[PDB]
Amino acid sequence: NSPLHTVGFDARFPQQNQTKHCWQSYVDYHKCVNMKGEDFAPCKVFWKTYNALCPLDWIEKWDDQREKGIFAGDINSD
Amino acid sequence: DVPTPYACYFQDSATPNQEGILELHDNIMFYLLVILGLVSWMLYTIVMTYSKNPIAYKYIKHGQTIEVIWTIFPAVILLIIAFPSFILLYLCDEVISPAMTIKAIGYQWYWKYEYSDFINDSGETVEFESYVIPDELLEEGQLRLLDTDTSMVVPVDTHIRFVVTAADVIHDFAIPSLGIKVDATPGRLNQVSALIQREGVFYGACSELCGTGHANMPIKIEAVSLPKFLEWLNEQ
Amino acid sequence: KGDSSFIAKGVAAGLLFSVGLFAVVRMAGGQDAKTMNKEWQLKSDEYLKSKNANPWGGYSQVQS
Amino acid sequence: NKVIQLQKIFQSSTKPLWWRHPRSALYLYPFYAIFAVAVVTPLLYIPNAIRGIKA
Amino acid sequence: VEKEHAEHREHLKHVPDSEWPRDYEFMNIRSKPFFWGDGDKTLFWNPVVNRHIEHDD
Amino acid sequence: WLYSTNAKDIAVLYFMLAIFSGMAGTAMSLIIRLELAAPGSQYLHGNSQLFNVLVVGHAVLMIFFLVMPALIGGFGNYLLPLMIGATDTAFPRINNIAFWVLPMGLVCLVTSTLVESGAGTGWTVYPPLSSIQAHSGPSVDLAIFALHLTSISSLLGAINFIVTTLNMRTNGMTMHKLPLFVWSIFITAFLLLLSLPVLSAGITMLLLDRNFNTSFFEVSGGGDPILYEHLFWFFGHPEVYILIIPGFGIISHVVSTYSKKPVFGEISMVYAMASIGLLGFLVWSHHMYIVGLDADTRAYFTSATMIIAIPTGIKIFSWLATIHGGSIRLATPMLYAIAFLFLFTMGGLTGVALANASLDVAFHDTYYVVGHFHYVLSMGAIFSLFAGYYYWSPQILGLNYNEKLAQIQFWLIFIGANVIFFPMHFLGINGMPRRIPDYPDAFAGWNYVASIGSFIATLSLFLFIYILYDQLVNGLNNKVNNKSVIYNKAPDFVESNTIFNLNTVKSSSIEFLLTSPPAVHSFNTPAVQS
Amino acid sequence: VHFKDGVYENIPFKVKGRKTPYALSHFGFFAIGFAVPFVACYVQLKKSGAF
Amino acid sequence: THLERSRHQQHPFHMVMPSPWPIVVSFALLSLALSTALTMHGYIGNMNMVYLALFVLLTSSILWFRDIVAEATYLGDHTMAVRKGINLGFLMFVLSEVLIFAGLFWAYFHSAMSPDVTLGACWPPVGIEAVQPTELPLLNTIILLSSGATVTYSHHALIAGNRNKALSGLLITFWLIVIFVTCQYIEYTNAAFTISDGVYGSVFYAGTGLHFLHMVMLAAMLGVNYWRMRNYHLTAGHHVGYETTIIYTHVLDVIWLFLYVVFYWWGV
């Protein structure tokens, strides 16, 4: 019937520019995997979000800036 | 959809977001024909009937009882016409309950969609470019500079939500039959949410200039049904 | 008195010398597109009829 | 000190005002030497800049 | 407070003692390098703060 | 003479260049419209470059080298000395650099095309399209400098007009009693001053991001190209309200001279003329509705740029009130000023349709915009430039212009440029994008209709050269035969012909009380008014 | 121009008394201004392969 | 009488002889702009034509200025209105050069008022270290508050009539500004971030960059205000070449205080 599923409204970013929605969901996922890891199901709501609404070259970028430690955002919560 | 030779109106409305524009382009031009109907009349009663008036009425300058009338007259139509113009702005950001997320990224000579929602069972995004077919590789019957090689499929009666950006020169994302137009800024990204309500192909164009190959970038998009779309998604 | 006709005979003889000068720059013109000669335009209609492009309105796409 | 002295020279001089200074003969012929070169050599390299010949 | 910074620049120009800390992508940009020399950052720049070592790796 | 500092002879050099840059600014638009005649690159062989070079090569000659130096330089350096009561301008030595940097603004632009690349950036020179990774050669380097030489001429060419009007008037010329052409440019001079230093930072920062790699605009570094879209357009909307306010000054003099009547609501026409200039500052992102602004930021501008149509309605309905009672003498400046009142206002109705944020999202960068801004540039700032030349040509040159031949130049401009710019609203309502050498085949319909007209308007311009030849050679043998009209104000019904030659010019300005041509010292005594 | 406010002496042209006819020097100022894009359509096509 | 009145000018406004430095400065602005765009792309080889273009331009200004002082103190059509013409022609001019800062202040409110994604979520970003306002930048504000208390200490002193305070009071203000060049030369030689340091490296050497590019002409403006007052050119009832220097600095207190509050105080 209705098998499709995606991220909802996300009222903290309600404008047309959803770039910080793509950025912070990359942050809120990778801040979850290092701090307070007890399960993955409330931790993959930030994984399933940033796979949507993000280009593939940006995720290749954000996983390359993270690898040399040159990630401009705060990546290490611990 | 498809433009028509010697046409003068909008392309066919396939979106309620597009359908709102056609009832606002006609709500505006109904109040533009009274103003054009006045000026085209008030300039023919002067050039014809008053070019044969040798005695000039040179003692009517101020007119206080008509000075204040035509300064509330653009303040009485504009207060009326803005209320259908406010109801379209605040009801075209309806990204409350969406159903699908598709991408559209333009690398200065093509587009690059990816269907990164993982409803597809393979668990991988489906990325594919969109090159226009040249005149040498032109299959006989294809629309020139309006038909690409790798098109794009979207379901019908679904609350889709695009994400449009670029990694280079700014050039926008325009389908006139759906009323979607966002810039594709390089540093950031934009969204639109356009529910398509009829099966059929829509052709669009890229509007904002990119460089030498600005004419060689169409945006082909066809709407199929939701089981018929899923037979394409489980393949690629 | 014989001057309002000289106005309307410079207008209507300026449109003739415009269009007559347009043909010289078109006959000194490059070769046109291959997708216009009435048969490319014909088969690009049942391609649209099989897809229902413009349901209400015209998708004729025929202007040789 | 020289304000009244130059005022005898500047007023009723019957000269162009840029030739009316007593210390002005040496101010022009070197100035017309740097003016006769700075308006041709930016422009003489333009046919050198049409054929790709750069430096 | 000038002298405690005048001695602070002598530390960085002496040795890095491993390497540079591998500065970010926005700090050093060299699209269309400069024209009065070969790769000069500006008209006057000391290497105590403007070393710009390439990390290809 | 070359470097004479008289303000009269500078403004005849201004007008000598605004036709040379005019016949170059429209020969480029000839080839632009010749390429849009048929699908497939006809005359340009296959080159989509030299078409974004010719479009920027044409659109900046028309804006900055035709309508700027004529309505501000070609007239303002001739009439604002004369109508107010000055002998010449207040700063007459910088009055000569404001012209002589304009041919140097041409060598910085014609050589910007002859170099190997060609600046294919468009008139709105956008940062990542014009960045050094995209445009490599010295083509766009000179195209951002010729825009700087004109930015600096017309900046000190408006400091020359605030300290001319404020102190250099006559005795009885109080601040409430001035000609409306002076109140056009003096209001314009408070927009030229407060928008061009905004532009001069918005271009030099692009220079710094191209050979000094400072990344004001470079994406690798967080520099937005969207900062440019509000910083250039902060100059851009006042700039197009500067090509029309001196256009609102000439029309207010012509339509109340060829109608023997003072203008309706003169004090109402000077308060609704700075309110266009003031409120034009507060609307500068209506060009960029789709670029991703906020849902309340676009909600403000869709209500704020409609209020520009409040004082423009006052300045039009009063021009339909200052000719209601009076006579009408249909000579050539009255024909232009009465077709300006129909084709500029139809370029205003398309303004408020584009003004909405709820409707620009189906109209941006289409040909519906080019249908709108050409009804207010080639029909609102050429219809007031032809109505300003013909209104002051034999008063200033001394020779009459063969009036029977200037009526056929009006109609070939009227119907021979309405045929171009009216079908542009149909190609854009379907969605033909701009600046493209080729198009989908369904857009070959009106693009051949709009191609037949560019030979009509540029055949009238070839005729306008011959009027300029008939005016200089045997332009003295025009007012002694029945070729031209001599007296622009015919006498009244009960005014006898033998008493008219005593009291001939019943003007309301000094411009006609002077000799034809005016003297090299037309003011050697302080004149008095009322 | 500093003095002599005559009839033809506020213009830097030389209309009457010219050695050559004036239509040479008047159309030759406005057709030369017309033929400058037709040399920008020449040295940029011949450089870029076309003719 | 009337015979001398028929031998003089009847309107107070100035009439200037035809000078050729109008087209000299115009030819310099061509060879400035054309030659600064060639050496960025080759075609010459050496970067000294721009150094030539800064020399022929600036000597054309003083030859323009030599004819003006020939009109200021040696021919003299400077009446009350013509004195009010330049004094309003320059006071309305600096409204343009205070708005070009709004073409550079507004970029600082474009990258810090809303945080971006290519940088960090903080301004100034990581890797970039800013100077606190409780350091040598606070010397730059007090040395102009002392400049704003000595430009008016010598403004009325020239009108006061004594030359012991009028002459010596402008030499102490001139070396108060050349010493301001050298402390804005420290941060051009000792600060960490450079001109190419992203968007923080862009606008910081632009907002404070253009504030450094005006002291080269302000100290050059004092370079003739001391030479003319020693060569007895300037007077104590009619001074335009001295009055435009004070309003070049009395508005400078306002723009630097607005430059100090957002670049350093709000910029950390």
Ligand code: HEA
């Ligand atoms: C002053 C402004 C001005 C004027 C007058 C014109 C006049 C004309 N323009 Fe242009 N045009 C622009 C400004 C102007 N244009 C701008 C800004 C753009 C957009 C570029 C960009 O953004 O990409 C543009 C773009 C543009 C396009 C491309 C559309 C797109 O890509 O956006 C086309 C093609 O049709 C075109 C055609 C014409 C034509 C046929 C005329 C005809 O009107 C010209 C022929 C008519 C004449 C005969 C009258 C003018 C001749 C004179 C010499 C003036 C007379 C004055 C004196 C002599 C006293 N113009």
Ligand code: HEA
């Ligand atoms: C040169 C003159 C000029 C003038 C005067 C105007 C005047 C106006 N312009 Fe236009 N405009 C341009 C030139 C001009 N414009 C140019 C060059 C561009 C950009 C093209 C480019 O980027 O290349 C542009 C772009 C432009 C856009 C951007 C579209 C796009 O790029 O996406 C918009 C939209 O808001 C707009 C609107 C208006 C409005 C509302 C007015 C209003 O001021 C006009 C209002 C006038 C009237 C309405 C008529 C008279 C009044 C009445 C009779 C009474 C009142 C009316 C009623 C009550 C209805 N203009």
Ligand SMILES: CCCCCCCCCCC(=O)OC[C@H](COP(=O)(O)OC[C@H](O)COP(=O)(O)OC[C@@H](COC(=O)CC)OC(=O)CCC)OC(=O)CCCCCCCC
């Ligand atoms: C780059 C620069 C290029 C410039 C080239 C532009 C060329 C434009 C030339 C326009 C021109 O010169 O016309 C003005 C000229 C003089 O007119 P006038 O104002 O002194 O008054 C005359 C009297 O009042 C009435 O003149 P009359 O009525 O007696 O003559 C009839 C005349 C009218 O028909 C036409 O106008 C169109 C043919 O027909 C003829 O003469 C036909 C003869 C073969 O009138 C004429 O006699 C025009 C004759 C035809 C010329 C060729 C037309 C080509 C389109």
Ligand code: CUA
């Ligand atoms: Cu991409 Cu235009």
Ligand SMILES: [Cu+2]
């Ligand atoms: Cu606008």
